[PDB]
Amino acid sequence: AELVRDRQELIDARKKELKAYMMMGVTAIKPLYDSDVNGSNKQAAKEILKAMRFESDGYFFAYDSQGINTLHAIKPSLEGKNLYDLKDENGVAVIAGLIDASQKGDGFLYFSWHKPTINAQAPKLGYAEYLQKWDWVLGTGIYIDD
Amino acid sequence: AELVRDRQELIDARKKELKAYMMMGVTAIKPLYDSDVNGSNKQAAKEILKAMRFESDGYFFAYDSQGINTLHAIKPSLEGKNLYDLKDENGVAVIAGLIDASQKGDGFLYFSWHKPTINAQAPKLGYAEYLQKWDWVLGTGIYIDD
Numbered sequence: 586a587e588l589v590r591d592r593q594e595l596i597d598a599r600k601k602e603l604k605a606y607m608m609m610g611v612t613a614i615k616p617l618y619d620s621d622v623n624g625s626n627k628q629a630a631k632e633i634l635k636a637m638r639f640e641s642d643g644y645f646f647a648y649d650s651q652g653i654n655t656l657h658a659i660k661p662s663l664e665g666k667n668l669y670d671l672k673d674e675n676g677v678a679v680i681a682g683l684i685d686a687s688q689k690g691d692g693f694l695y696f697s698w699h700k701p702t703i704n705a706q707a708p709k710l711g712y713a714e715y716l717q718k719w720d721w722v723l724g725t726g727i728y729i730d731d
Numbered sequence: 732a733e734l735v736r737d738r739q740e741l742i743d744a745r746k747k748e749l750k751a752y753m754m755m756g757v758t759a760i761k762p763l764y765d766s767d768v769n770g771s772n773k774q775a776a777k778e779i780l781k782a783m784r785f786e787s788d789g790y791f792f793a794y795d796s797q798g799i800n801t802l803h804a805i806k807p808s809l810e811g812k813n814l815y816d817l818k819d820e821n822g823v824a825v826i827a828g829l830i831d832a833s834q835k836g837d838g839f840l841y842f843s844w845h846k847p848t849i850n851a852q853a854p855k856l857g858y859a860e861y862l863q864k865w866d867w868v869l870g871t872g873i874y875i876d877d
Contacts, residue, residue, distance in 0.1 A: 602748070605785040609755045612784045633779065638758045639751040 596710070599727045600693065603712035606639050606725055607692075611714060613637065618718065627719055631656045634723070641702050642728050647721040650688075652680040655721055659701055673697040674706055687713035687722045700728050742856070745873045746839065749858035752785050752871055753838075757860060759783065764864065773865055777802045780869070787848050788874050793867040796834075798826040801867055805847055819843040820852055833859035833868045846874050 613633055617626035634645045635658040644658035652669025668680045677696040686694045692712050700707035713724035759779055763772035780791045781804040790804035798815025814826045823842040832840045838858050846853035859870035 598744075602751075605748075605789070606751070606755065609752065609759075609783055609785050612782050613755075613759050613779055615782045616778055632762055633759055636758050636761045637755055639755050643751070 596729075599710060599729075600712070603693075603710070603725065603727060606643065607712055607714050607723070610634055610637060610645055610723060610725065611716070618716065621718065624719070627655075630719075634658070635661070639725075642700055643725065644701070645723060645725050647716075647723045648680050648684060649720045650684055650722070652684065655719075659699065679711075683711055683713045683724055684722050686711075687715040687724070695729075698726070700730070742875075745856060745875075746858070749839075749856070749871065749873060752789065753858055753860050753869070756780055756783060756791055756869060756871065757862070764862065767864065770865070773801075776865075780804070781807070785871075788846055789871065790847070791869060791871050793862075793869045794826050794830060795866045796830055796868070798830065801865075805845065825857075829857055829859045829870055830868050832857075833861040833870070841875075844872070846876070 614630040617630045620626060635656055637658070638644055646657045647655045648668065649655055651667065653665065653667050654663040657663040671678070671680050673679050673696045675697060679694070679696045679698065682694045682696065686692050692714060694711045696709060696711060697706045698709050699705070700709070707728050707730045709726045709728050711724050711726035713722050715722055760776040763776045766772060781802055783804070784790055792803045793801045794814065795801055797813065799811065799813050800809040803809040817824070817826050819825050819842045821843060825840070825842045825844065828840045828842065832838050838860060840857045842855060842857060843852045844855050845851070846855070853874050853876045855872045855874050857870050857872035859868050861868055
């Protein structure tokens, strides 16, 4: 109950951080998002969000509501691929889970994903917000392998 | 010694956050900064950094090495003013202190400044990094009145 308490504490602190980082990404592209005319500014917003980091493993991705990747900071070759049916190594439907978390839930999802600093799968806590004008489920995450 | 310990803990956690937020701002403008030709991209970088927030009180400012404000997210009327000699209510030379922290020190400075959510002075912990190509001391901060 005691070492479990310290873990919940660490998790909750990370969830607060994730909400802040998400706010930074959303507000960084706000001038573009607000002034957009039929997707005119999406490319410019992608270039900003794909450059942003809060640490080496701290980056943005986005998917549309059909699970098609619209931007990926780490692996831009995912862009335009439909990953709706994608499962992690534990059978978590990652993309569908993030789309649903962001639209119908609290934004959070536990899953495993490539971790940049070790180039291998690791457990992650993702956080996503839905940007309806562009149909982007914009997400980031913290790795919990610690 | 005990309630003092908990305060140092809270401070250190905030310093870690500040370094992350600063990284986000610096990386958000990296495409522009890297491709800049004689200040061509400064205006576009200003527009991004002035929109960013990590909370209502969480924003960017920048000054050049002479103490002239180059961007201010909250009070853009400061832009172009020389605030090198500015002192807070406790006589802290805020602008000179941030310029020196960012160039010769650890980036951090305690001072009081307008706090957006109460529209009044409050104690703050600022954090600044020097962007030499543009001579910008780019900074943000967390309020410590809690």
